[PDB]
Amino acid sequence: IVMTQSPSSLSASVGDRVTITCRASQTISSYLNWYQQKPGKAPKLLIYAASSLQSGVPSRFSGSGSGTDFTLTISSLQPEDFATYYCQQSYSTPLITFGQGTRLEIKRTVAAPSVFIFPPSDEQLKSGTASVVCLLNNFYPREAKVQWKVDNALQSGNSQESVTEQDSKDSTYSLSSTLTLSKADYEKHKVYACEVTHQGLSSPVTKSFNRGE
Amino acid sequence: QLDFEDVWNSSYGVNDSFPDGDYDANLEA
Amino acid sequence: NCNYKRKRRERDWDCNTKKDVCIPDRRYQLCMKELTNLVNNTDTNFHRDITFRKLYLKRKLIYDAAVEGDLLLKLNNYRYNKDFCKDIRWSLGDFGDIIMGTDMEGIGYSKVVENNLRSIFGTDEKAQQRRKQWWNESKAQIWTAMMYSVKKRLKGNFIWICKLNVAVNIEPQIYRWIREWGRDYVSELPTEVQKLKEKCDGKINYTDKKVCKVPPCQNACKSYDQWITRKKNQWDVLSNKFISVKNAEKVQTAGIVTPYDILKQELDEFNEVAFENEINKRDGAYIELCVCS
Amino acid sequence: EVQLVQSGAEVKKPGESLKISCKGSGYSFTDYWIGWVRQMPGKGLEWMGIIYAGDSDTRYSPSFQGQVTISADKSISTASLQWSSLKASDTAMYYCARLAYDSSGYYYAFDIWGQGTMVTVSSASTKGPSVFPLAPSSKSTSGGTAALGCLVKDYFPEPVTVSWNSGALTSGVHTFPAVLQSSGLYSLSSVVTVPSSSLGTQTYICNVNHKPSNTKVDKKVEPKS
C-alpha cells in the first residue's frame, strides 16, 4: 500500500487556507491518520480515522476523504502551524506505511540578499589552508545561486553551502558558502569573487577582493 | 431488585468462613 | 430487560437457527442488560483509559451475573441443590465465552455486546489474548456475584454446595453444552419411556404386542418418535461441532477424545452402548414396546 | 504520566555493534505494540518494524528485514533496536512509538512517541575546532551595516554552540548549519550584522563551545589594518 502526498512543499502566509492531499494506491476506507512534526521535534498524532481530531488540536484543522483520496485542511494558518505533515494508512494493522510528507513554508514578499565576502584570516593561512566565505543575508525565496571565480576562472567542486531556517521575525533565509583552497593555490592568485543570482536582483551581484588589502 | 451496591462489595475481599456442603444437599431460600 | 426464566424444557434446543450448533434456551435468555448498554466515558482523547474501561465493564458484568444468578435460583423454585449449581456453571461459562469472544450464538444483543467489548479491548491480533487474561483474573469474582442471591437468602445457614474450582474451569463452549444437553437427555428419557409403559407395557391377549392394534399405544409411539428424532438430531450436530472444535484447537483436554467421553464424565450411570441404542431407536425397550415385528 | 523515554545520542565507528532502547512507563507495557521509525537528516518517516511487548511477536518492513533486530524485555518495560555492524548510511534519528486504538477499537495510530535517539556513524574521532575571525571591513558593508563572524572549523562530533557577547548580542545573529567536509570533520560559520559605526567602540566576541572535546574559545573579532 503506497501513500503519495502532494504537494511536497507549500508556501502560505498566516491567515491563509491550505489543503494537503494524500493518495492511497488501493482503497483503505477511513483508515488514515495525520501527524505534525516541527523541526527537532517528535511527530504528534493530529487526525485519526481520516477526520477525527486528537485532543488539544484546534478546530481550524479538519480531515476529509474516504477510499483513496484524503485531504487535510487548515482553515486559517497560525504561526505555530508551519510544520511538516505526514499521512499514514492504518489499514494493515500493525504493518505501517507513511507518506513522504508535505512541508509548510511561510510565504513572504521577495527580498534581495545583501552580499559580503570575507578573505581567509591570517591566523588560518598560518595553518596551511585558506577558506573564503561568501554570505548572502536575509533573502526570499530560498532559491539562490552562488558562483565562485578565482582570477575569472569558475570554481567547481571546492565549495560548500549551508542555509538557515526561516527567520522567526522576518521569515527570510540566509546562506553561507565557503570556498576551500590550499594556501599554495590561494597565494598563486589575485582576484577572488562570489557571484550571486537571486530573484530579487535585476542582474547578478558580484562581491570580490584582491589578495592583499 | 437486588441492592447492587451490596452485590459489588460482596464480590471480592469479603472472606467469611462458611463450610463445604455435599453436592447432593438440597436447601431452601 | 432481564425477565423471569422460562420453565425448563419449555423450549428444546435450537438446531434450526444456526445450522451448525444447537443453542440451549438458557443461553438465549442469558442476562445481558448492562453488557448491552454500556457507553463511553468522557475523555475525547484518542486512546482512553483502558484500565478504567475494564473497571466499568467489571461492574456492569457483576450486575448482570448477579441478576442471572437470582433468576436461576427462581427457576429452580428457590432450591439450593446441584441442578442450580450446574446452571450457575453453564451461564458463568457463557459469560466467559462472550467476554473472550469465543461464543457460538451470534444473534441480536450479542453482536452489540461484541462491539462494546471491542471498544474496551481493541481489535488487533492480540486483543483475544488480552480478553482471555482479563476473564481469567475476573471469573471467580464474577462467580461470586452469581452466588450473591443464594448466599444472601440462606444467611447463617449457607454452605458451599457449588464448588468454585469446578465452575471457573475453562473448556470450549461445546464441551459445556454437551454436558448440559446430556443432563437434559437423562431427565427427558425416563419421563418419555414411562409415558410409553402407560400404554404399551405387557402383551395384549397373551401373545400379541399392544402396539400392533391398540391406538392409544400408537399415538404414544408417534410422540416418543418425534422426541427421539430430535434428540438424535441434536446429538449429531453437537458432536459435529465438537469434532470441528476439538481438532481446530491446540489447548488439549486430557481425558476427552470424543463426545461420549464428556457424557461419561458428567452422567452417573452413563452407558455408551445403551445410549447409542436409545437415540438410534434400536434399544431393547423401544423394540418390544413399539415395533410390531 | 504515559511516556516513552529513549536512550541518549550515539556516535559510533563503522563496523561497531549498537543497541538503542526505549522504556515505557505509566501504562501496561505488555499490552501494546511498539513501533520503530527512522528519519534520515532532512527526510521523512520510514516505518522499520513493530513488536508486541507481551509475547515478542515481531514484524519488519521489507526494507529493514534482516538489516536490524527489534526486541523487547517486559520485565523492564523496554523495546530495543540493534545493529550487528553499523554503516555510515545508518546515520539517522530513530523513534519508538506506542500503537494504540481509538474509542471504537478499530482505528490504530501512534499516539505516544519517544523523544528520538540520534545515531551518528563515522570513522572520524573526537576533535575540537579551530576558531578563525571573519573580520569586518569596507568590503563587508552595505549601507551603514557591517557584517562580521566566526569560522568554526574542523571538529567532531557534530554539536558545537555559538553565542555572541556571552548572550547579550542576539539580534541579527545567524549561525549556519554545519557542513560535513571530505575529511569527515564538520565546519560551521556564525555571523552577525551590526551598525558600522559601532566598530572600534563596541566589542564583538563569539563564544564557541564544543563539549565532546571540552573546547571553549572566546574569539575577539576586530577590523583589520
Residue numbers in the entry:
A (entry chain D): 21 to 233
B (entry chain B): 19 to 47
C (entry chain A): 216 to 508
D (entry chain C): 20 to 244
Provide the authors' original text about this structure:
The human malaria parasite, Plasmodium vivax, selectively invades reticulocytes in a process which requires an interaction between the ectodomain of the human DARC receptor and the Plasmodium vivax Duffy-binding protein, PvDBP. In the case of P. vivax, invasion of red blood cells is highly dependent on the reticulocyte Duffy antigen/receptor for chemokines (DARC). PvDBP is therefore the primary blood stage vaccine candidate to prevent vivax malaria. However, DARC is post-translationally modified by sulfation of two tyrosine residues, Y30 and Y41 and mutation of Y41 to phenylalanine reduced PvDBP binding.
To test whether these sulfates impact PvDBP binding, we therefore determined a structure of PvDBP-RII in complex with a sulfated DARC ectodomain. To determine the structure of PvDBP-RII bound to sulfated DARC ectodomain we started by expressing the N-terminal 60 residues of DARC (DARCecto) in HEK293 cells. In the presence of tyrosine sulfation, we see an additional 17 residues of DARC, binding in an extended conformation around a protrusion on the PvDBP surface. While this is the only region of DARC observed in the previous study, we now also observe clear density for residues 31-47. These form an elongated peptide which wraps, in a horse-shoe-shaped trajectory, around a protrusion on the surface of PvDBP-RII subdomain 2. In contrast, the side chain of Y41, together with clear density for a sulfate group, was observed. This docks into a positively charged pocket on the PvDBP-RII surface, where the sulfate makes direct salt-bridges with K301 and R304. Indeed, in our structure, the Y30 side chain was clearly visible in the electron density, but no evidence was seen for sulfation, suggesting either that the sulfate was not present, or that it was disordered in the electron density. The side chain did not contact PvDBP-RII, but instead interacts with a neighbouring DB1 Fab fragment through crystal contacts. Residues 48-60 are not visible in the crystal structure, suggesting a disordered linker between the PvDBP-RII-binding region of the ectodomain and the DARC transmembrane region, which starts at residue 61. Our study also reveals the epitope for the growth-neutralising antibody DB1 and shows that it binds to a polymorphic site distant from the DARC binding site, as predicted based on previous studies which show that DB1 does not block DARC binding.
